[PDB]
Design a binder for this molecule. Sequence first.
Ligand SMILES: [Mg+2]
Ligand SMILES: [Mg+2]
Ligand SMILES: [Mg+2]
Ligand SMILES: [Mg+2]
Lengths: 285, 285, 284, 284
Amino acid sequence: KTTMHRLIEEHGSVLMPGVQDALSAAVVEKTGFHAAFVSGYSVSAAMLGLPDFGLLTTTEVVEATRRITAAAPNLCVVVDGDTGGGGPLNVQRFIRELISAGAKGVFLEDQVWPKKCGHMRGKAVVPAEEHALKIAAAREAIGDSDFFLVARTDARAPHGLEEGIRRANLYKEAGADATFVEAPANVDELKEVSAKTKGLRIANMIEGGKTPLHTPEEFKEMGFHLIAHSLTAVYATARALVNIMKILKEKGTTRDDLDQMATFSEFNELISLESWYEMESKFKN
Amino acid sequence: KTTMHRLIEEHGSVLMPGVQDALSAAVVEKTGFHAAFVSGYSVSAAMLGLPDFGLLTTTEVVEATRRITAAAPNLCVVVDGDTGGGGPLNVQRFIRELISAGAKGVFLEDQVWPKKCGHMRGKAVVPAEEHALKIAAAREAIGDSDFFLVARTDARAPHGLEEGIRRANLYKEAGADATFVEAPANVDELKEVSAKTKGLRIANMIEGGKTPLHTPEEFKEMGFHLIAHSLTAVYATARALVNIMKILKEKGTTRDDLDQMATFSEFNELISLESWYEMESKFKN
Amino acid sequence: KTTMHRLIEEHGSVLMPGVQDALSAAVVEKTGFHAAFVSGYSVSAAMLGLPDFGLLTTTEVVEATRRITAAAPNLCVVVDGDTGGGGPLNVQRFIRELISAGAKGVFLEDQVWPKKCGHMRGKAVVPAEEHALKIAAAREAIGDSDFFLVARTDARAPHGLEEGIRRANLYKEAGADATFVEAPANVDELKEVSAKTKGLRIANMIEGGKTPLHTPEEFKEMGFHLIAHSLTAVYATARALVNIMKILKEKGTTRDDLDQMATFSEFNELISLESWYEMESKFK
Amino acid sequence: KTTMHRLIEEHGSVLMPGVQDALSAAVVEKTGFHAAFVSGYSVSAAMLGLPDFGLLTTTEVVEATRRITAAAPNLCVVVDGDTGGGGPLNVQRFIRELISAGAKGVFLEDQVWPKKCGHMRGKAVVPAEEHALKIAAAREAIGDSDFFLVARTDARAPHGLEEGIRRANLYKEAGADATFVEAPANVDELKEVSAKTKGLRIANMIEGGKTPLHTPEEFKEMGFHLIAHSLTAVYATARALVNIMKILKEKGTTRDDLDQMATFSEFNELISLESWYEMESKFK
Ligand SMILES: [Mg+2]
Ligand SMILES: [Mg+2]
Ligand SMILES: [Mg+2]
Ligand SMILES: [Mg+2]
């Protein structure tokens, strides 16, 4: 059916770096990866300068998705759908719009709106049944479309692995392609997720988050098929930005320390300047 | 009149890091800077994954400007206006829109549309008079609005410092607040720009570009008042992204090398997570 | 001392036609009105072709706002905010955004999300305190901004006029500038709202609606200050398009029905083709 | 074998009403037409309240397109591309964007930037080869895409019908699917374009325009295949808004002129309030 399906087949567990925009999406594709995750958290920070505090609207992740699609046309793009922007009807519209934005899948959550990062302090969740219907709602919207449907549960934090899990299996029944139990606290937890969730499983790596950091081979072992590395891109970026700007402020110059930036061979290699010069010429007289 | 004016007074030459979005704009403000430059080149790469090859529309830099404004409300934001999006009438509309997008100034160019980076291989320029009118056009649109009007000339590349310069003085007559002679090849050139251009002068530092890299004290000396450091932010970003993603691809994990990313103390310190938690609480019962 | 407060004083009942894009805002401003309301209902239809089902997002409403505002830069423009996009924080990003988008007011509503129209079949409502807090939040985010705040309650249908009224009064105390009890069913019910809600009051005229149709001069008498005429524009528009496109479809041309469309001088009068040609020549 | 090529074959002259947003696209589709044209003129007015002065950007036209497309997902939608946003590269980003936005064709024009309308006072034109190349570029960017390409020439006013014609033929050879000589002044001039331009031909009906008003069945006879009826919608609309808002302003209410606005079942018929209520109940 799906590119995720044909992707989780061809490989063991698929590593899907988190992306916050076109340049990052570009770098991800260029580095060989076959999938990428439009991260709400990242998009919030990068696009709006906002904490993952449920301020980012469904409309905005769509705009960002459209750009990221265009910029990395090959990358199999999966989008952070948060709450899914309302009730069933909102979800469906949102789904339809992401299919038009060129994406190939969603994550949708358990949380009360407005939501927070799954590794953040004070989350709450709607009754399972209520979200089940939304999965069901997205399911119908997707139809034949090439669209992977990940149902996420933030239930562990306030209710423990038990709750989180049963919700996972319920969303699977509802018609999800795969399941995502957010923020397992350790290995044991992870492995326990793997034993009592029916079908394909996600797992989200967050540097300094609440889960142990593992590899596609290690996850294949534990039985997780899609690995979102959500904040790698943004987190790297933020350091680099703070570093270079400090250097800039106190010297007033990059002049001395240029090993922090990139080359033009490289930057333009990155974006294919030469490649364009070529197209441009095909069309003068 | 302007915040640039009152800024170029309070300081000698103002260092204005180039910005490509909210997160970067945020980091710039947070690091003490008093000004920032919405770079078309950066916005192209970051927002669209596109080379500075004149594909970015006036409408898009406006959207980006609006976000960057909101995200760094204090930063005195100056926008890369490229060609200015058409003829006089387009410029005016564009100007009006940037004033609404919360910005405080523009750079507008000499180039034939579609334009290219000022440090790029094959640029062309419209007759001086033609651009003079556009400066004049923006001038009237600005009125009392708090808006700094930098007129840029890309004439050096294809016609030499002479042409570039006379164009500079002409755009000054036309009503520009300050003047920008793009891509002086060396010090001598710079200093020559400073001797025969009447009034306030810009200077653009591009890492590995065609100009020598200098500091606000050094520029104050040479007589340049506004220093755009256009590609620092984006260039740092691109390295960091390529680095981390390579590491990610070949290990499948950041686990070992976490000194490349940022902390949560730090990331959230960056965006003020705690600060939000505080506002959020003011309003529960 | 907000612009609207000013308008409600210079006049007695401000009449505020609904508007759903740039052209309609223009026509509205060109017609002599001083205030205009961005209708979420209208906008779903005009801008997205969607029933008023709480699909139109807060992002969408703002874009919509921006254009309306630029095109009709004098109209005191007031935005239907529906639910406010979620919690008090979402409300606050939204007020900020709207202020940035050139508006001077919002209406914020009682309803569960996703909201429905105000004269539509199924409506539920969040606990009054919850909205009182959103209002409050709104208020703080408004600060000095010239931005008239309207608290709407949709409680009348599910709960009777009493609730509608206490909630209005509750929301006034939480710092709205004016209060809107949706869908009084008739004159008595208006007068009752007028008698029992303290402060500035909104009425909302919708043709075919549950509330009876009345004029400013009359409303002035019934103690109402801000009359939304929300769906008129979209409604006139919709009929116009349906008629013409029938003709165009059946007769294959407009040839015989030209008096349906507007005039060159007329149209240009609405969008100023002479104001432009001039500015254009000034800079040739 | 593009959708439009299909439409021009199933029928003889395709009649393609102009449309400037979601509601109008809807009405147009709901009325039985199979094709619709996104009018840049219309859109400047409706969406931004701007004279057709080449202010509407390529970005703007696309957003506009997307909405129109979703709301009217069967209408074979064809976009007024004006100048194409600049050089051949800009043309190409634009074709891509439009294909992504769900369209099935564009019209690309001869004019210097910034363009004006096609029946407006001052018009100049770029060297034919320059546009031929843009067309070509367009063509390549189109590839397999179901996307009917129209090359428009505005040379008739500044240069006479001869230039208009050679340029059309020039642009056909550069790989447009159809050709549009703007503003033949009358029947003779149409027939002359019909006789001297090779391939598929566009005519563009504008009420008050320079070209005389004719029907598909007639145009079929004069050898034209795609008739834009570009400004009708906006024009009907504009009159509708001006009348109503006069009434609303003078009488203070719509109370006495209700037959100007549309019906609840009617309106909802255009935007499907029953289709929704149903999907809604399916998931409660
Ligand atoms: Mg998220
Ligand atoms: Mg630039
Ligand atoms: Mg509403
Ligand atoms: Mg046009």
